[PDB]
Write a protein that binds this ligand. Structure first.
Ligand code: FO2
Ligand code: ZN
Ligand code: ZN
Length: 337
């Protein structure tokens, strides 16, 4: 399933939507994981919050000014921490003449303006805010409590984060911490555009990045983990790196899969909610994740190897666990489909 590894979109009914982990297993049985990114449009009747007119007093403790340097589709993003601000203050800046979205008809025109102007007039990203916009009673796809096997770490990446975007705010090329999955919900506002590289081609993106930034690569085993590297889709086309693109709109979920490299940008004022999560398939990725060797987020895999792979525990502890990851294989939970 999904031999082209193209980004798939799913429209679950209210009944299919209710079981989060089962629905992740379902989309994997359909080959969604091969693209490294999937869109899930929830049923129309489902709302995580009745209204977003009550969040003006919400504090963004560390807004970041995003300074970008580069040319020829290759850039490095530098984050400058600014003083705390409210969502009311952030919305005022986001919609001001200095930072508002330029006029555009088609996405391709806006995508061009982004790649042409990302190094000018550095925007402010109200990123990494600990919090949720979900009402406490919401039991479906609740980013604040997904209750996947990732909870075994607790029972930081198992908590919800908010992202208040403005035009031209960006997320650099990366995989998740420990090559985990992630869920991103766009609560409201202007779209968020995504680029993705299939996990089966992730090593090709890394080789391209290493060749362009040899200083960074010598300094760290996993420099892409710093989340500072921006590469244009045109630069990827030029070097034959397979990739796909998708625009997430308000009210839609995006799912990133283990070792799924993604990057993207915000079209204007918006707010997304995200967290990391796991399935039984992730354990092997966590065991094999190449981590940052210069700073970082590290999860001990021991608890997972003991519980889900007891027969492999002595072999693994000895450093003799030679398992090769097949990126095309769905999670064992997908068996029923
Ligand atoms: C401690 N961890 C640091 C990295 C954090 C992280 C990992 N990935 N990641 C992102 N991925 C996808 C989309 C977005 C986005 O729209 N904005 C900003 N960051 C994003 C953010 C998770 C938390
Ligand atoms: Zn991510
Ligand atoms: Zn590093």
């Amino acid at each position: 399933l999904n031999p082209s590894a193209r980004i798939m979109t799913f429209y679950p009914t209210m009944e299919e939507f209710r079981n989060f982990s089962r629905y992740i297993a379902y989309i994997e049985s359909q080959g969604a994981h091969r693209a490294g990114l999937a869109k899930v449009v929830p049923p129309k009747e489902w709302k995580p919050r009745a209204s977003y007119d009550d969040i003006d007093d919400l504090v963004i403790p560390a807004p970041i000014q995003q300074l970008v340097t580069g040319q020829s589709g290759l850039f490095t993003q530098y984050n400058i921490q600014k003083k705390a601000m409210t969502v009311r203050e952030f919305r005022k800046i986001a919609n001001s003449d200095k930072y508002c979205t330029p006029r555009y008809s088609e996405f391709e025109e806006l995508e061009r303006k982004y790649w042409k102007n990302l190094t000018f007039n550095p925007p402010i990203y109200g990123a990494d805010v600990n919090g949720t916009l979900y009402e406490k009673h919401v039991d479906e796809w609740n980013i604040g409590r997904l209750r996947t096997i990732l909870d075994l770490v607790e029972k930081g990446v198992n908590t919800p984060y908010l992202y208040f975007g403005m035009w031209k705010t960006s997320f650099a090329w990366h995989t998740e911490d420990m090559d985990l999955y992630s869920i991103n919900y766009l609560h409201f506002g202007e779209p968020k555009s995504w680029y993705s590289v299939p996990p089966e081609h992730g090593k090709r993106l890394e080789r391209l990045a290493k060749g362009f930034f040899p200083g960074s690569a010598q300094s760290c085993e996993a420099f892409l983990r710093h989340k500072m590297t921006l590469i244009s889709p045109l630069m990827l086309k030029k070097y034959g790196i397979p990739f796909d693109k998708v625009t997430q709109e308000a009210g839609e979920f995006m799912i990133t899969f283990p070792y799924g490299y993604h990057a993207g940008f915000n079209h204007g004022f918006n707010c997304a909610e995200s967290t990391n999560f796991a399935t039984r398939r992730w354990i092997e990725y966590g065991k094999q994740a190449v981590l940052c060797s210069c700073r970082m987020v590290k999860i001990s895999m021991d608890v997972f190897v003991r519980k889900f792979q007891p027969e492999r525990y002595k072999l693994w502890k000895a450093g003799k666990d030679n398992t090769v990851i097949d990126h095309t294989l769905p999670t064992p939970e997908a068996a029923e489909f």
